[PDB]
Design a protein around this nucleic acid. Structure first.
Lengths: 178, 216
DNA sequence: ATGCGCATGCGCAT
DNA sequence: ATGCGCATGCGCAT
């Protein structure tokens, strides 16, 4: 998507998306039975909008933090690939489990190639950085030769897939968490 | 916020602070007359949580891009020892909010403060039926259930002097870490069913079979 | 001695 | 066509 430069269209979209956020969140909080809120902010003068909606009592709890969150936010304000984080927490590539790597790699691929679907098994879709000793095949199930498995554990091969991608894009800053 | 006035939210609210958080969340929606209802099956509920978080992330992304405005979703489960506190959305608001995990958790817990030898069956504080637990959850639960049932810190796996009186006759008295049944035993009863039988037998023996079937 | 949690396959909804 | 998440062994810290 793109920022909507026309304000009339921007207010139309805001209304549509905010409302869709409310309906999706209401479905989430009821069906999952979990406290969750959406928080939207604009520090525009002279009255910044601090809009919270979702589950009670989380909604009123978060509202009490308007002044502090607004303060802290003005302040933070003072080749793309995902950061090495699983659920908002940073992980070393060497810290990720096989299960974390199997989930991380298809997301990484989307960023690296631009494709929503990787096209496993089609050589025309294989990235240039794909490791030479790993078949271009769904990481769902290791299909390497049995001697390949003796040399390199599957967890280590999966880490190599990730390391090759970040280095190919020159994103050591993300891989090593500078 | 009055949660006792519906059976599902009633059972949720009596499970403790995680369940009170859940009951209050479901009750928020009952006030808006919304169509949906809570999902008692933890495998379906996990699947819906995944689908629905994906949709929220995508809508937050579109909103933040098209409207140009910082926006996050925050989800919390006040569990112990590790509470769920996931924030996602626009940066840097995402990281601003993360720094208040401490305060927001204690503030949520405050606002929510408004007879069995055997523990309740819950997944991360949410009541669950024994027939809906996964194999991993049953296998992890059994050694904790043995501590409660026998009072022993160590179960003495394989010591016949430690085998519980309710232990199922067609399962070796052996660490549920690894199924050591014979192949014919394995063909007759799935490992998940055997593990359910271990649990069911224990609760039956203690007279607390009512703790086994949350939400039917 | 014993259970936490990874490894990894693979069912199956997508 | 594709990746979530359950089934179970087992490494290994305790």
């Amino acid at each position: 998507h793109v920022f909507e430069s026309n304000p009339s269209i921007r207010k139309r979209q805001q209304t549509r998306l905010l409302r869709k956020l409310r309906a999706t969140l209401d479905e989430y909080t009821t069906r999952v039975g979990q406290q969750a809120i959406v928080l939207c902010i604009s520090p525009s003068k002279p009255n910044p909008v601090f809009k919270v909606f979702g589950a009670a009592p989380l909604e009123n709890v978060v509202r009490k933090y308007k002044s502090m969150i607004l303060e802290d936010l003005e302040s933070a304000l003072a080749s793309e690939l995902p950061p090495l984080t699983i659920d908002g927490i940073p992980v070393s590539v060497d810290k990720m489990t096989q299960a974390q790597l199997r989930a991380f790699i298809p997301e990484m691929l989307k960023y690296s190639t631009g494709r929503g679907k990787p096209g496993w098994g089609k050589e025309s879709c294989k990235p240039i950085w794909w490791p030479e000793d790993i078949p271009w095949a769904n990481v769902r199930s290791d299909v390497r030769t049995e001697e390949q498995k003796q040399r390199v554990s599957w967890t280590q091969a999966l880490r190599t897939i990730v390391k090759n991608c970040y280095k190919q894009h020159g994103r050591e800053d993300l891989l090593y968490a500078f």
